[PDB]
């Protein structure tokens, strides 16, 4: 079952779905049940592309115990959530339809991703 889905507005990077086994999630002891990373390094879960001012590991999305998602900026050049730059190494709550934005040029072009959160997974407390 899918936790959330990530859509590109410009559309250079097709839709990506991110899932998690609900068995293995409840078996986890830690308050952070799963982590996805987004960055220039294709080792990441989501490749933001080989754009140099994008950090190799630029931000992470964390699945909380509550079933909610958190955004961790871990980047050199910053990460914007609904057009406001989040504090680096902080943990911000992701709401439905939120827009995560990173810088690509010094000219002020952007890469922009939108989170679509599957409510059926959250409610799936089986």
């Amino acid at each position: 079952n899918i936790v959330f889905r990530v859509i590109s507005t410009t559309g250079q990077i097709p839709i990506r779905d991110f899932s998690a086994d609900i068995s293995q999630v409840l078996k986890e002891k830690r308050s952070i049940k799963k982590v996805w990373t987004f960055g220039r390094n294709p080792a990441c879960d989501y490749h933001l592309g080989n754009i140099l001012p994008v950090s190799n590991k630029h931000f992470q999305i964390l699945l909380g115990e509550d079933g909610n998602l958190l955004l961790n900026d871990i980047s050199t050049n910053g990460t914007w959530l609904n057009g406001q730059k989040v504090e680096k190494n902080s943990y911000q709550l992701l709401s439905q339809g939120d827009e995560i934005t990173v810088r690509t040029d010094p000219t002020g072009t952007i890469l922009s991703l939108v989170i679509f959160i599957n409510d059926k997974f959250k409610q799936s407390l089986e």
């Binding site: 220039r40 140099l52 001012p53 994008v54 950090s55 190799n56 050199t76 050049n77 010094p106």
Partner: peptide
């Protein structure tokens, strides 16, 4: 393989 600033 490092990352250029603003």
């Amino acid at each position: 393989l490092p990352t250029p600033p603003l």
